[PDB]
């Protein structure tokens, strides 16, 4: 015989303080026992399991399950308890490759490694913990006891240990054949290259010879799997990729469940279909969680859906990555906090697309959202391609410069160019850095009774202009905003405003262009109409004139 | 030879911290560095039975053509036991900050000569990721004391003392301070003389079998602070006076004797913001009394080694940044301002990252530990960019300020 290299076992432990599982074996039907005995007899012959003596205290339940329209049985061991007690492992299967990061391949061949899959040796010291019992016929004899010698299907460490073992034997082949790629998924190996077909098939045969050194045979037969591959919700083709078919149901009535499913499909679709929007549809899921509850669609949701149906009307494919070319990312504002993007190398051929939604908060602006979108795309691109794309952004260079230089926070976006593609992101207002000569000065204030919720807001000016308005169902913070609103409303195109409100300053210094607060929105609307606005803060209760006068007026 | 036993803190498991995404050039640099380290026995490949992870990346240090591996051990360092048996902690030299020149050397390479305790090695696990996760990340752990780990200077401290023993007796006026992978050497001599002596020290290291050649020159005796100062003006607008009263009101939380009463009285009326108001005698006296108060140190300020240092930073515009280091609010242990711009002129975030490094350095020199930062930046912007600008071998802790501080005005 030909000596083969053994697979070194991975040492395994239970979690600290925990012992192995001891779980009662369910009674089974006479025929299930007979079928399990047959199955285990064969498995034992292959060295996968061994009979053990009475001294092993451990047990895990075993079941027999029908082949469903066939007569045959399969053994299922329920490892739930042992899994709870087994140490954590390094999980490599997180970090799924994105198709848009793959490189085109002329050939991709699949090899069946299924016989390795069930044959990986298990750490000798851990085997005792895998003990199981075939119940005896009539229970007039001791059950037949076995333990595993190999990684059992369903056990916590099997995927990680099989993956690490396979990678280790593949490493020298990969390293010494830089002209191919190899990827393992379940019991298959996928080997791609650009080689002339003859050379490719030679590489495949050499790979088979390499695996033979560990005793791993692969079928001489021609694999049934061919490109295109259905993989992780994608279609992979030699020169292009897409998501598997996305078909949106028509329904006269929609439930919470149907909406979650609809949004899921749309989210999945958005990585290739440009312009997908989920805002209005996602809303219908706010609160609730009663699953069978039917939600009437708003007109807004109907429109969003119709827009999506149009986008999904015919198939769209992405191309693969060419490392020799720059990555370009282009972004568009879609409205209602929604942003959409395309990443490409050559014009009109996207590698992938995607979307970004505005974060939750009381106030926001387009520039901040655009910035967040840029950071997200950047991070994604590092993951997929290992570099930042060059950005094309619908914001003028001068607008960006005015923004970042004056914004209270440090902020940055990487190399980018303006693309003139409405709607453009712009600054709706900017406050003065110095008080305005010749502009009327409004000293504003407001106050409310916390019990009755009664309040007042108003102003007094250097021209003797004055206003005080009575208010109901209000708060101190609200009256402070109301007072600023009145001064904006009653002044000319240039105005100086003096407030003691740290709350109002905090909001205005954040430069929102939109707010969940009705009042902030009205304030923003007024600011947009001004030519010049200087906002001055002073401390309350200090005897600062015009602030004290209006404080007295509004305090009732 | 002869590993020192190390443990985590009671009830704590090792770090499992996600590797963040790395650029192609950083991955290639790390593959190259780690291949050499593995050959030299410093690190070894590990298997799936090791669940732990600590993030790694690569930097280019100051004036350098080659990458340096930087492991972010922050999580591990928190989870690692403090160091007691021989070492109680070393009284932090108070003279270090008083030296004319302090040069900073990276001595971290010396740590690789000491084997790491066999039972603790698994907790140093790290991963070299692959682009688009197309190949399994490369998994390693340290066989020796890693750079950036809290335990390394502690365990190596015995060896370091012997190495520098002849240098310290030959040069008694010199303060040597070690923090993490850094060695801080102060001297009052002429900078040319200071430099040769630094190179004298380097030879002591190299001769003992082994980025050392580099040095980073500080002059902490030139480090200056920011007292609260008030404008001196011939004519005050209403707006000037409101700004003054605002600033004094703020100052009165720091200095109790501050009074705004007379100055505020000038504000009585409802007046145009740009109108000039003559100061009354009472106003001038008050302003004068306030100025005098502000020339004094703050009352009851003391450093507590058992408390965190907190560092706040404000962006002042035009590449200017102000900062304060404190334990309790309004009792500032240090304040300062950075003007000087090395590159970074179109990049806010690069500027901030450099400010963060300079402040931490000052913190290490003065107190021997790093502050927790309150950064005026959005989390996502910072997290995406900071590693691109990082030149230090340690990393501090930070949190993010989302609400604009009103007090920016007054540190300006
Ligand atoms: C992640 C991955 C999944 C499958 C297969 C998963 C399944 N089922 C097959 C391979 C070979 C890979 N690995 C890589 C690595 C680099 N480029 C590529 N490009 C590439 C892959 C497949 C096709 C096709 N058709 C075209 C190009 N694949
Ligand atoms: N001893 C037989 C055997 C079992 C499994 C194998 O594949 C492995 F690499 F472990 F995943 C390779 C060989
Ligand atoms: Mg008031």
UniProtKB/Swiss-Prot annotation, chain B:
Substitution effect: residue 183 to R: 20% loss of DNA-directed DNA polymerase activity. 21% loss of RNA-directed DNA polymerase activity
**What effect is documented for mutating residue 182 to A?**
Strongly decreased RNA-directed and DNA-directed DNA polymerase activities. Loss of pyrophosphorolysis (reverse of the polymerase reaction). No effect on RNase H activity
Q: What is the effect of changing residue 287 to S?
A: 59% loss of polymerase activity. 8% loss of RNase H activity
Instruction: Relate the outcome reported for changing residue 283 to L.
Output: 68% loss of polymerase activity. 10% loss of RNase H activity
Q: What is the effect of changing residue 217 to A?
A: Complete loss of RNA-dependent DNA polymerase activity. Complete loss of RNA 5'-end and 3'-end cleavages
Q: What is the effect of changing residue 51 to G?
A: 64% loss of polymerase activity. 57% loss of RNase H activity
The residues that the entry says bind Mg(2+) 1 are 106, 181-182
**Per the record, what is the consequence of mutating residue 216 to A?**
Complete loss of RNA-dependent DNA polymerase activity. Complete loss of RNA 5'-end and 3'-end cleavages
Tell me the outcome of changing residue 180 to I: 54% loss of polymerase activity according to PubMed:9533880; increases polymerase activity according to PubMed:9657675. No loss of RNase H activity
The segment annotated RT 'primer grip' runs over 211-219
Site annotation (Essential for RT p66/p51 heterodimerization): which residues? 385, 398
| Reported impact of residue 153 to G | 34% loss of polymerase activity. No loss of RNase H activity
Q: Impact of altering residue 385 to L? A: Almost complete loss of RT p66/p51 heterodimerization. Complete loss of polymerase activity
- Effect caused by changing residue 185 to A: 37% increase of DNA-directed DNA polymerase activity. No loss of RNA-directed DNA polymerase activity
Show the coiled coil region(s).
none
Q: What's the reported outcome of changing residue 163 to D?
A: 16% loss of DNA-directed DNA polymerase activity. 24% loss of RNA-directed DNA polymerase activity
Q: What is this protein called?
A: p51 RT
Taxonomic source organism: Human immunodeficiency virus type 1 group M subtype B (isolate BH10) (HIV-1)
Taxonomy, top ranks, is: Viruses, Riboviria, Pararnavirae, Artverviricota, Revtraviricetes
């Amino acid at each position: 015989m030909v000596p083969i290299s053994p697979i070194e076992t991975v040492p395994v432990k239970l979690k600290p303080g925990m012992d192995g599982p001891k779980v009662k074996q369910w009674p089974l039907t006479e025929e299930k026992i007979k079928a399990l005995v047959e199955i285990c007899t064969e498995m034992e012959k292959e060295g996968k399991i061994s009979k053990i003596g009475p001294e092993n205290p451990y047990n895990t339940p075993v079941f027999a399950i029908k082949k469903k329209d066939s007569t045959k049985w399969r053994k299922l061991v329920d490892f739930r308890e042992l899994n709870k007690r087994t140490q954590d492992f390094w999980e490599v299967q997180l970090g799924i490759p994105h198709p848009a990061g793959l490189k085109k391949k002329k050939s991709v061949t699949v090899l069946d490694v299924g016989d390795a899959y069930f044959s990986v040796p298990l750490d000798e010291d851990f085997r005792k913990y895998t003990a199981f019992t075939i119940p005896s016929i009539n229970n007039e004899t001791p059950g037949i006891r076995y333990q595993y010698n190999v990684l059992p299907q369903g056990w916590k460490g099997s995927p990680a240990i099989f993956q690490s073992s396979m990678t280790k034997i593949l490493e020298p082949f990969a390293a010494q054949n830089p002209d191919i790629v190899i990827y393992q998924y379940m019991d298959d190996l996928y080997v791609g290259s650009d080689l002339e077909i003859g050379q490719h098939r030679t590489k495949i045969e050499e790979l088979r010879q390499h695996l033979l050194r560990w005793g791993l045979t692969t079928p001489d037969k021609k694999h049934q799997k061919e490109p295109p591959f259905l993989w992780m919700g994608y279609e992979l083709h030699p020169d292009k990729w897409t998501v598997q078919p996305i078909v949106l149901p028509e329904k006269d009535s929609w439930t919470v469940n149907d909406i979650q499913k609809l949004v899921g499909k749309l989210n999945w679709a958005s990585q290739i279909y440009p312009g997908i929007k989920v805002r209005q549809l996602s809303k219908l899921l706010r609160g609730t969680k009663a699953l069978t509850e039917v939600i009437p669609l708003t007109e807004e949701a109907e429109l969003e859906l119709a827009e999506n149906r149009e986008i999904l009307k015919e198939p769209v494919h992405g191309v693969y990555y060419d490392p020799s070319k720059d990555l370009i990312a282009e972004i568009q504002k879609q409205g209602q906090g929604q942003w959409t993007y395309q990443i490409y190398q050559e014009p009109f051929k996207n590698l992938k697309t995607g979307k970004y939604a505005r974060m939750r908060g009381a106030h926001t602006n387009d520039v901040k959202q655009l910035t967040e979108a840029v950071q997200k795309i950047t991070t994604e691109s590092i993951v997929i391609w290992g570099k930042t794309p060059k950005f094309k952004l619908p914001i003028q260079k001068e607008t960006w410069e005015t923004w970042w230089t004056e914004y209270w926070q440090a902020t940055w976006i990487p190399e980018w160019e303006f693309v003139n593609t409405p709607p453009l992101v712009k600054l709706w207002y900017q406050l003065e850095k110095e008080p305005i000569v010749g502009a009327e000065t409004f000293y504003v204030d407001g106050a409310a009774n916390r019990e009755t919720k009664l309040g007042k807001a108003g102003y007094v000016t250097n021209k003797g202009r004055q206003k005080v308005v009575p208010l109901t169902n209000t708060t101190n913070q609200k009256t402070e905003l109301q007072a600023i609103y009145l001064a904006l409303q009653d002044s000319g195109l240039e105005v100086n405003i003096v407030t003691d409100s740290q709350y109002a300053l905090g909001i205005i210094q954040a430069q929102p262009d939109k707010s969940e607060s009705e009042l902030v929105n009205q304030i923003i609307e007024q600011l947009i109409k001004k030519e010049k606005v200087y906002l001055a803060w002073v401390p309350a209760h200090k005897g600062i004139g015009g602030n004290e006068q209006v404080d007295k007026l509004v305090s009732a | 030879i002869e590993t020192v036993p190390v443990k985590l803190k009671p009830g704590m498991d090792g770090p499992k911290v996600k590797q963040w995404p790395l650029t192609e050039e950083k991955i290639k640099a790390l593959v190259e560095i780690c291949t050499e380290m593995e050959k030299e026995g410093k690190i070894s490949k590990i298997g799936p039975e090791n669940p732990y992870n600590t993030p790694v990346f690569a930097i280019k240090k100051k004036d350098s053509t080659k990458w340096r591996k930087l492991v972010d051990f922050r999580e591990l360092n928190k989870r690692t036991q403090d160091f007691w048996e021989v070492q109680l902690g070393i009284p932090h030299p108070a003279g270090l900050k008083k030296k004319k020149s302090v040069t900073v050397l990276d001595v971290g390479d010396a740590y690789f000569s000491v084997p790491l305790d066999e039972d603790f090695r698994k907790y140093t696990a790290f991963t070299i990721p692959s682009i688009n996760n197309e190949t399994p990340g490369i998994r390693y752990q340290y066989n020796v004391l890693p750079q950036g780990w809290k335990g390394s200077p502690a365990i190596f401290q015995s060896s370091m003392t012997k190495i520098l023993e002849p240098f310290k007796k030959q040069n008694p006026d010199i303060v040597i301070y070690q923090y993490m992978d850094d060695l801080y050497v102060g001297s009052d001599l002429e900078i040319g003389q200071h430099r040769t002596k630094i190179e004298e020290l380097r030879q002591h290291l190299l001769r003992w079998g082994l980025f050392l050649w580099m040095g980073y020159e500080l002059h902490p005796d030139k480090w200056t602070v920011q007292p609260i100062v008030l404008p001196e003006k011939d004519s005050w607008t209403v707006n000037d006076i409101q700004k003054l009263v605002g600033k004094l009101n703020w100052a009165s939380q720091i200095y109790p004797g501050i009074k705004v009463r007379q100055l505020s009285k000038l504000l009585r009326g409802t007046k145009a913001l740009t109108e000039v108001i003559p100061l009354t005698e009472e106003a001038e006296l008050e302003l004068a009394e306030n100025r005098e108060i502000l020339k004094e140190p703050v009352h009851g300020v003391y450093y507590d080694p058992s408390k965190d240092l907190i560092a706040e930073i404000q962006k002042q515009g035009q590449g200017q940044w102000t900062y304060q280091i404190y334990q309790e609010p309004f009792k500032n242990l240090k304040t300062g301002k950075y003007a000087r711009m090395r590159g970074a002129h179109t990049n806010d975030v690069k500027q901030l990252t450099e400010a963060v490094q300079k402040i931490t350095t000052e913190s290490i020199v003065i107190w021997g530990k790093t502050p927790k930062f309150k950064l005026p930046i959005q989390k996502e912007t910072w997290e995406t960019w900071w590693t691109e600008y990082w030149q230090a071998t340690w990393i501090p802790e930070w949190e993010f300020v989302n609400t604009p501080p009103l007090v920016k005005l007054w540190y300006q």
